[PDB]
Amino acid sequence: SAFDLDVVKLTAQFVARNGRQFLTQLMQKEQRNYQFDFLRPQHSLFNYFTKLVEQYTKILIPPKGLFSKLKKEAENPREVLDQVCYRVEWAKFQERERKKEEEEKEKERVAYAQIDWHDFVVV
Amino acid sequence: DATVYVGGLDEKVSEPLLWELFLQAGPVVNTHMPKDRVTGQHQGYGFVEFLSEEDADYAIKIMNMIKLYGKPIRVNKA
Amino acid sequence: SSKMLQHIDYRMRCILQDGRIFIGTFKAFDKHMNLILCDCDEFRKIKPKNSKQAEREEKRVLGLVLLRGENLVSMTVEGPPP
Amino acid sequence: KDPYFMKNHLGSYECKLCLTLHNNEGSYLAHTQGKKHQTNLARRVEVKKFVKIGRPGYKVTKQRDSELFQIDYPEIAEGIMPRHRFMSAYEQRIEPPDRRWQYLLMAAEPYETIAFKVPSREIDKAEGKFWTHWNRETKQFFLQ
Amino acid sequence: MKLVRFLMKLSHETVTIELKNGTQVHGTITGVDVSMNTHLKAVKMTLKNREPVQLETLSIRGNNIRYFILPDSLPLDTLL
Amino acid sequence: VKLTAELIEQAAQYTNAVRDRELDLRGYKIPVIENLGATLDQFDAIDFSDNEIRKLDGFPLLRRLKTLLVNNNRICRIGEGLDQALPCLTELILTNNSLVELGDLDPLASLKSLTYLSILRNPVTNKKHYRLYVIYKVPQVRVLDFQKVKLKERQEAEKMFK
Amino acid sequence: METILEQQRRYHEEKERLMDVMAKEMLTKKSTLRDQINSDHRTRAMQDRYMEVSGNLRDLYDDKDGLRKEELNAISGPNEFAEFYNRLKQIKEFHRKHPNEICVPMSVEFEELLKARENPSEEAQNLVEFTDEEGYGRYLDLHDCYLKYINLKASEKLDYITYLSIFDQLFDIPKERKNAEYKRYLEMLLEYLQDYTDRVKPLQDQNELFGKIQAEFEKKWENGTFPGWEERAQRLFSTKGKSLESLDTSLFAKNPKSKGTKRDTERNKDIAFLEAQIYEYVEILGEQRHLTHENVQRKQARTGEEREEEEEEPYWLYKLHGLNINYNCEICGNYTYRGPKAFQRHFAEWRHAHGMRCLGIPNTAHFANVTQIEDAVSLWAKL
Amino acid sequence: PEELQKREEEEFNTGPLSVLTQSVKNNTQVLINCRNNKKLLGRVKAFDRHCNMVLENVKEMWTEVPSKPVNKDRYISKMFLRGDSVIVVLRNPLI
RNA sequence: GGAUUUUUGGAGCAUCGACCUGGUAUUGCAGUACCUCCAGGAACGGUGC
């Protein structure tokens, strides 16, 4: 599975340097008798592979290391600790929201299993 | 192909009772009920081997709405 | 306890009272701090007695050696049983 | 209190731990001390009653779509969403004859259930989380 | 009372045994017998005017040991 | 099959015929010698018979070693850092090698404590003035190819290549 | 190699994995002080590795500015991609899937149930950096410093309480002279205090704190950090008073003050820096010193038993029944049986029936003792 | 038994080690001479019949020649000294 | 585990191994200290006092 991953990485590297949505380096290669099944959205890996192209967008950021140098994430451990604490607080808030959604689903299942299903009214 | 797995049975069910329950849809050639010899209780699952695969498939497809001791019994192909 | 029998039949190095070190397979011991070192070799350091001379250690193998407890100072484990 | 020594039907003593027999009473107490006995010992409703029922007037509107019913409900001031479910016409208050169709009914806690009969077998899905929605800002239920 | 019983009831203690011929072995003493045989593991031995080597295990006898040194976090009333 | 710590730990280490600790490692065909520091300086002779070592290099610092047996191998080149790893090396058995040029013995003269040498059955010995060049390169070697050095051979080595 | 496309994305993914591992370590609750100290040391090592990875990725920008004109050009495109696909058109006979492209940094930055330690931090141990008397930052070892002070003072009239009272001062009068032999012990005590402060908090920035301490020693402590109302301005090195600020500024550049004394700013600058570091360590870690003094007082006021309690915290059955005898059954795929009665019980079972149903022979009583397939086929054809 | 313990107590209170009995009575410092010319000044917390002493907060002083030898000394919190290296034991030291 | 054999302490000279050149007889089957004799040079090392 290394050759398919390398081909997907090469397609994500060649498709990130495009100036339009349809005028890329992979749309013209489909008509050049080159079999590329990773371009269709029906595949299971392409939804990750285009996400790898989003990782190519992570290589296309101006503070990513192309024209500037990061100083808070590279020369400040306190900023990284504050970012880790904010990520832990966001994960705790997401877990609390998931617990509230599970409690709401349990309350809806308790209310749906206790209602009267014999009072039928056709208007 | 001729053996069907019956699960979801209580511990109070016996092997002649399971044979009499399975004989209502077809004559079963053999019935194996795995049980622990240390405690002497059933595991709630058994395997009924009939004389043919079509009769076993019909007995597995016709026992989808069987209830024993308040518990629904499930039949699958094995 | 049985701490002396735990390192049996291993290549142990016992330090002598004169400064030499005898390394050998400590197979048998006793209550009088004796040791039966099979295929043992004794190494003794020599004094340079000069300003530019280095410190050397002459080593000679003797085989099975019966070391008493009056000369043994401390024994250290050096090699596992082959 | 020995849980292994029992009395048989012949006036003797039986040890089920080591499966031994003893005729007199002096042999049962002397059988516990030994190697075999030591080896055998070592080897071994509230939400339904509190729901108000006033039966108000519902406002349901159907529309034949192609690729949907819309119910206008008042403000319930609660997080309980109205649930839709498909049932049969065999269970009723009067049990009228010639009832062999299905009916999808939507029920809420402050309001009554609105039911619509479907003559077709399967043309849509009556699932609550698949093709249903309930806008609380406008308080409107949609079922597709 | 003999002092061998106070030294035999010592386990996982970082002590330092100074020998007679200018040798000092500092390490965690793991075993002590009635004949003052000190068996230690992962100790450091320093001889007379020599470099301190490190040994994974050592066994000093009773007649070769000259003095002992215990840390300050060790009561002497409960060991005697 | 490469040489590792498991090949040295499972080897048979005993007493040799010269009253020294030797570990037998014959019949291994190791292409490279590495990770030999597991002996913890408890051996005096290391045998490397029937090996496919192309170059004698990658030896750790061992002060207790006094004999090297690299016979029956395919060593064509020799390493330069051999004196800093074995300061007490006295015996060197480099017989049946692939040495062709006379410059291969120039890192071999760095060992000052070397007294025994064996360069027999080698193509470097077939050339002219090979023993004189070996005597002029390493004067501390007293026995070369099971033969003692000579005074006339030392005079011819000091006279030639002036 | 794609140093700006693939390597930068790999470094960003490694930094995101390190940040996720640090957030998972910080979000989990702690129950012991040693496990919390080990988790803090692992988080500090992960932060140092992430800083090293960011410093290695930040230097890969020299060739990116020259290659950005050719990578973003519209004249290029599928030609280099087709050349790279033709170069990667080798034999694919190595049928082996490698799912460790992204799961291996996720598993390397995690811990196990038996040992709560990371894969780069598997060889780390809390016993190699802290002693048993310190308690992994709970207390401070001051027995060796008290022994060194008693050896330097050459008097047995100084106990541990007197040494703790003398070490608690920050700007008071010293117990000995500044030009005496106590500075060599004070520098070692300041180094031990700095090592204990660095080991007690591994997640704090030690280099920034050292730079701030050096800036406070240079810009403030060298310019009259202790004002007065000889009592107006005092010097830490020269140990002399001053009338006003202008006289102190004129005497700061004097010839006995520069190199014409035994305690000037040229030779006694390291001792003054060590004294400032010891004062900063006493002001920053005063609570740990107070807890160590309270523990020493509790150990001294207790008895021997309380101090000892505080410092400690069958073949015959197989031979008679016919077992352990190898028997081969050629009907059920030449299976092995360890008993004649066991083979007779397994002959009328489901496994032998399923083995015989593949050949077409029904399960009857005539094929009970049948073992070979040819004899069973002959018995089936004869009936 | 009890009689042997009473005889050992009488031999420790009225024998040659009775000055050692002064080390555990009033907690006075004693001067012990070693075989390596190292004088140990300090009180004895525990003793035995084989002259094995347990010293607490002792000071070991010796002479080491680098000329003239210097009196390099050290201070130990707790130490144990065997009776084989004990040469001379002084009850009341000078300083 | 407190006093003669083990664990509660006796704490420039002599000798031996070698290094390098010359003449001389033994060509031999064995578990071993050692191993033919003489002359010249040494600016090699170990132990005791």
Curated annotation (Swiss-Prot), chain A:
Function field: Component of the 17S U2 SnRNP complex of the spliceosome, a large ribonucleoprotein complex that removes introns from transcribed pre-mRNAs. The 17S U2 SnRNP complex (1) directly participates in early spliceosome assembly and (2) mediates recognition of the intron branch site during pre-mRNA splicing by promoting the selection of the pre-mRNA branch-site adenosine, the nucleophile for the first step of splicing.
Record's protein name: Splicing factor 3A subunit 1
Subunit composition and interactions: Component of the 17S U2 SnRNP complex, a ribonucleoprotein complex that contains small nuclear RNA (snRNA) U2 and a number of specific proteins. Part of the SF3A subcomplex of the 17S U2 SnRNP complex which is composed of three subunits; SF3A3/SAP61, SF3A2/SAP62 and SF3A1/SAP114. SF3A associates with the splicing factor SF3B and a 12S RNA unit to form the mature 17S U2 small nuclear ribonucleoprotein complex (17S U2 snRNP). SF3A1 functions as a scaffold that interacts directly with both SF3A2 and SF3A3. Identified in the spliceosome 'E' complex, a precursor of the spliceosome 'A' complex.
Lineage, broadest ranks: Eukaryota, Metazoa, Chordata, Craniata, Vertebrata
Location(s), subcellular: Nucleus; Nucleus speckle
Site (Critical for binding to SF3A3): L10
Domain characteristics, as noted in the entry: SURP motif 2 mediates direct binding to SF3A3.
Name of the gene: SF3A1
Positions of SURP motif repeats: 7-49
Curated annotation (Swiss-Prot), chain D:
Zinc fingers (Matrin-type), renumbered ranges: 13-43
Compartment(s) where it occurs, according to its Swiss-Prot or TrEMBL record: Nucleus
Domain of life where this protein originates: Eukaryota
Phosphoserine: residues bearing it: S88
Function: Component of the 17S U2 SnRNP complex of the spliceosome, a large ribonucleoprotein complex that removes introns from transcribed pre-mRNAs. The 17S U2 SnRNP complex (1) directly participates in early spliceosome assembly and (2) mediates recognition of the intron branch site during pre-mRNA splicing by promoting the selection of the pre-mRNA branch-site adenosine, the nucleophile for the first step of splicing.
Family membership noted in the UniProt record: Belongs to the SF3A2 family.
Assembly behavior: Component of the 17S U2 SnRNP complex, a ribonucleoprotein complex that contains small nuclear RNA (snRNA) U2 and a number of specific proteins. Part of the SF3A subcomplex of the 17S U2 SnRNP complex which is composed of three subunits; SF3A3/SAP61, SF3A2/SAP62 and SF3A1/SAP114. SF3A associates with the splicing factor SF3B and a 12S RNA unit to form the mature 17S U2 small nuclear ribonucleoprotein complex (17S U2 snRNP). Identified in the spliceosome 'E' complex, a precursor of the spliceosome 'A' complex. Identified in the spliceosome 'A' and 'B' complexes.
Record-given protein name: Splicing factor 3A subunit 2
Curated annotation (Swiss-Prot), chain F:
The keyword NAD is assigned to this record: no
Repeat positions for LRR: 19-40, 42-63, 64-85, 88-109
Keyword NADP in annotation: no
Subcellular location, record wording: Nucleus
A single cellular component GO annotation: small nuclear ribonucleoprotein complex
Organism superkingdom: Eukaryota
Effect of Y14D: Results in defective spliceosome assembly
Domain spans labelled LRRCT: 122-160
Outcome of swapping E91V: Results in defective spliceosome assembly
Primary location recorded for the protein, binned into one broad class: nucleus
GO molecular function, one term: U2 snRNA binding
Keyword set, alphabetical order: Acetylation, Isopeptide bond, Leucine-rich repeat, mRNA processing, mRNA splicing, Nucleus, Phosphoprotein, Repeat, Ribonucleoprotein, RNA-binding, Spliceosome, Ubl conjugation
GO biological process, one term: U2-type prespliceosome assembly
Effect of R26Q: No change in spliceosome assembly
Function of the protein: Involved in pre-mRNA splicing as component of the spliceosome. Associated with sn-RNP U2, where it contributes to the binding of stem loop IV of U2 snRNA.
Subunit text: Identified in the spliceosome B complex. Identified in the spliceosome C complex. Found in a pre-mRNA splicing complex with SFRS4, SFRS5, SNRNP70, SNRPA1, SRRM1 and SRRM2. Found in a pre-mRNA exonic splicing enhancer (ESE) complex with SNRNP70, SNRPA1, SRRM1 and TRA2B. Contributes to the binding of stem loop IV of U2 snRNA with SNRPB2.
Family: Belongs to the U2 small nuclear ribonucleoprotein A family.
The name this protein goes by in its record: U2 small nuclear ribonucleoprotein A'
Organism: Homo sapiens (Human)
Lineage: Eukaryota, Metazoa, Chordata, Craniata, Vertebrata
Positions spanned in the full protein: 2 to 163 of 255
Swiss-Prot record, chain G:
Chain ranges for the short sequence motif Nuclear localization signal as given in the UniProt record: 175-179
Region annotation (Disordered) ranges: 294-313
Pfam families: SDE2_2C (PF13297), SF3A3 (PF16837), SF3a60_bindingd (PF12108), SF3a60_Prp9_C (PF11931)
Source organism superkingdom: Eukaryota
Gene Ontology terms describing biological process: mRNA 3'-splice site recognition; mRNA processing; mRNA splicing, via spliceosome; RNA splicing, via transesterification reactions; U2-type prespliceosome assembly
Cellular component, GO annotation: catalytic step 2 spliceosome; nuclear speck; nucleoplasm; nucleus; spliceosomal complex; U2 snRNP; U2-type precatalytic spliceosome; U2-type spliceosomal complex
Protein name: Splicing factor 3A subunit 3
Organism from which the protein derives: Homo sapiens (Human)
Gene: SF3A3
